[PDB]
Amino acid sequence: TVFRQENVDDYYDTGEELGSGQFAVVKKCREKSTGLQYAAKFIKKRRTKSSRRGVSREDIEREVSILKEIQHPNVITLHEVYENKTDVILILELVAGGELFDFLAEKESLTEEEATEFLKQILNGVYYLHSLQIAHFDLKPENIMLLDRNVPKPRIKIIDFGLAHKIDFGNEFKNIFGTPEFVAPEIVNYEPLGLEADMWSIGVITYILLSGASPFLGDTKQETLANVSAVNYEFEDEYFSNTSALAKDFIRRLLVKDPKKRMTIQDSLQHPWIKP
Numbered sequence: 001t002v003f004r005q006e007n008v009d010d011y012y013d014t015g016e017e018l019g020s021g022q023f024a025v026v027k028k029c030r031e032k033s034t035g036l037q038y039a040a041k042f043i044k045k046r047r048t049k050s051s052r053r054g055v056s057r058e059d060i061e062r063e064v065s066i067l068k069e070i071q072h073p074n075v076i077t078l079h080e081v082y083e084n085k086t087d088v089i090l091i092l093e094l095v096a097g098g099e100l101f102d103f104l105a106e107k108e109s110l111t112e113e114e115a116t117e118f119l120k121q122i123l124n125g126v127y128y129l130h131s132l133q134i135a136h137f138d139l140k141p142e143n144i145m146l147l148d149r150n151v152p153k154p155r156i157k158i159i160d161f162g163l164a165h166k167i168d169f170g171n172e173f174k175n176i177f178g179t180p181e182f183v184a185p186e187i188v189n190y191e192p193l194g195l196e197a198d199m200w201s202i203g204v205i206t207y208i209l210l211s212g213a214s215p216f217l218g219d220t221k222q223e224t225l226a227n228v229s230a231v232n233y234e235f236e237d238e239y240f241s242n243t244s245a246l247a248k249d250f251i252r253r254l255l256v257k258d259p260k261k262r263m264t265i266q267d268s269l270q271h272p273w274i275k276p
């Protein structure tokens with residue numbers, strides 16, 4: 001599928017940089033015809049078939065195809081796509097309140113009410129995605145953006161569909177692999193993957209929200225991955241002594257090695273810690 005090949009600068013002006021990663025940079029921008037503001041994600045294309053730099057056309061097209069399906073208050077949306085010889089440029093919805101990661105670095109730990117206010121929105125977004133058989137595969141606090149961080153109960157949107165896949169057979173076997181602290185054991189073990197992997201990541205996020213600590217983090221990536229595969233985590237009393245047993249139960253039923261025994265998104269919404 002081809003994208004708009006007019007110069008994006010003919011239609012948008014860019015401003016502050018929002019972040020950058022291995023293959024992409026995101027810049028705030030403003031559409032000239034409407035004055036409306038967006039986030040332009042410039043993804044570097046692969047320059048040869050066998051290269052390891054840049055992102056393959058197949059991978060870019062997958063991210064775009066999934067994003068085109070999405071319209072939900074808790075998930076980022078896609079406005080337009082441009083391309084030139086060097087980049088594909090996604091014109092994404094602008095969510096300007098910063099990463100949940102940075103919000104957490106300030107509070108250092110959330111109350112259960114604050115955590116569940118965020119988690120209910122994350123669960124609602126993931127429920128929408130999983131209902132469409134979309135596995136995100138990269139859920140973590142850096143990929144949850146706040147609309148406005150200066151309100152008591154910030155609203156959020158899930159971002160970053162660079163690893164997302166449609167799961168139309170119940171599992172995909174593609175060597176998908178995200179951030180070690182957040183990947184499920186089936187990712188670590190290179191096993192068939194499905195929607196269940198996201199539910200594990202939600203368990204990790206919840207543990208972090210409540211404690212400020214990462215459940216599986218070792219001193220090296222290989223230690224973290226070994227800890228994940230072995231389900232090597234525990235609720236440290238220093239962090240969790242005043243946390244409810246029901247909150248621990250919610251986490252415990254997500255950090256389950258066997259994907260078939262792990263809570264699904266629907267289970268998580270009915271769990272007594274979440275359900276009103």
Ligand SMILES: Oc1ccc(/C=C/c2cc(O)cc(O)c2)cc1
Pocket residue numbers: 018019020021024025026038039076092093094095096142145159
């Ligand atoms: O509306 C938005 C759409 C996308 C983004 C992306 C921000 C971002 C943050 C990082 O730490 C690294 C990165 O590569 C990108 C921010 C807002």
